[PDB]
Every structure is written in C-alpha cells, then in structure tokens.
Design a binder for this molecule. Structure first.
Ligand code: CA
Ligand code: CA
Length: 87
C-alpha cells in the first residue's frame, strides 16, 4: 500500500504514489509531482499525511488521514513539501 496523490478533484488526472517519508519540493518533482498541483489523495487507514504549503515542511500545514476527493480550497494546488507516516 501507499499514498497516492492526484492532479484533479475526486482522484482524477495524473497520479503518483509514495511510500512513507519526508519529501521536499525537489524530491516531489523527481517523483514526477509538480509544484502547486495536488488536488486529491488516497490514504491507507492508519497513515497520516502532512501537506505543507511551502518547501522543507514549513508554511501552512494540512493533515489528512483518509481518502480525500478534495483537499480544500486553501490547500488546493499548494503542496510544496509533504510528510507521510505509516502511523
Ligand atoms: Ca490540480
Ligand atoms: Ca505552495
């Protein structure tokens, strides 16, 4: 299992899956995830996803613990860095 980030609302468009870890903007890009692009994501039960508005896990932080068809108006297309936990 893994966290899957999607380009469009309700899990539409391009997608990219990631294992637990702390990913910076550069690392997201390498994994084929553009900046200000994430709109929805699926999260395994028991996992936690901290999406940060700025690089290096700073700026506003939005947390998700279950499938999310829409991250929210403020959080939409703002993920620049992200921490993923299997806890
Ligand atoms: Ca988008
Ligand atoms: Ca941003």
């Amino acid at each position: 299992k893994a966290v899957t980030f999607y380009e469009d609302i309700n899990y539409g468009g391009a997608s990219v899956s990631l294992q637990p870890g702390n990913y910076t903007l550069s690392q997201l890009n390498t994994a084929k995830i553009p900046n200000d692009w994430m709109t929805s994501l699926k999260v395994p039960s028991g996992w936690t996803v901290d999406v940060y508005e700025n690089d290096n896990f700073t700026g506003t932080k939005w947390t998700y613990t279950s499938d999310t068809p829409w991250v929210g108006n403020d959080a939409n297309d703002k993920m620049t860095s992200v921490k993923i936990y299997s806890t």
